[PDB]
Amino acid sequence: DDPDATSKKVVPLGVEIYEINGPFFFGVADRLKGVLDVIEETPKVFILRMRRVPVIDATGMHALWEFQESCEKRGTILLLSGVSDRLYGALNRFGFIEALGEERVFDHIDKALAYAKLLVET
Numbered sequence: 001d002d003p004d005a006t007s008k009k010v011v012p013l014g015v016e017i018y019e020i021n022g023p024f025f026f027g028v029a030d031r032l033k034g035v036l037d038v039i040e041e042t043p044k045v046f047i048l049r050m051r052r053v054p055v056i057d058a059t060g061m062h063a064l065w066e067f068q069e070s071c072e073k074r075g076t077i078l079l080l081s082g083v084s085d086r087l088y089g090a091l092n093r094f095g096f097i098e099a100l101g102e103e104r105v106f107d108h109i110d111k112a113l114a115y116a117k118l119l120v121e122t
């Protein structure tokens with residue numbers, strides 16, 4: 001039924017994955033807030049799966065910025081996966097693509113996982 005389900009992938013140890021359930025508005029923002037402060041073993045790489053996310057508002061954008069800042073404070077590398085052309089446009093206009101780095105943004109989980117594995121191997 002879902003060939004790109006995280007359960008169908010090989011996820012390296014030290015890589016955490018978080019899947020967003022839909023439009024990235026206040027509901028998602030409240031759920032993502034502080035996630036890194038509640039993981040005991042801080043991940044080397046954190047992949048935010050955004051295949052279900054076509055749109056993001058100011059509240060979700062604020063939460064994504066603070067999430068990226070918590071990753072930096074933790075030495076965790078944030079990757080975005082499943083980013084559609086529409087979501088990319090919104091993230092770019094917000095200034096997030098240039099702050100994160102283009103090379104950290106992927107259109108598919110397989111590509112993000114490939115880069116995650118490379119990162120852990122270093």
Ligand SMILES: [Cl-]
Pocket residue numbers: 048049050051052081082083108109
């Ligand atoms: Cl994804």
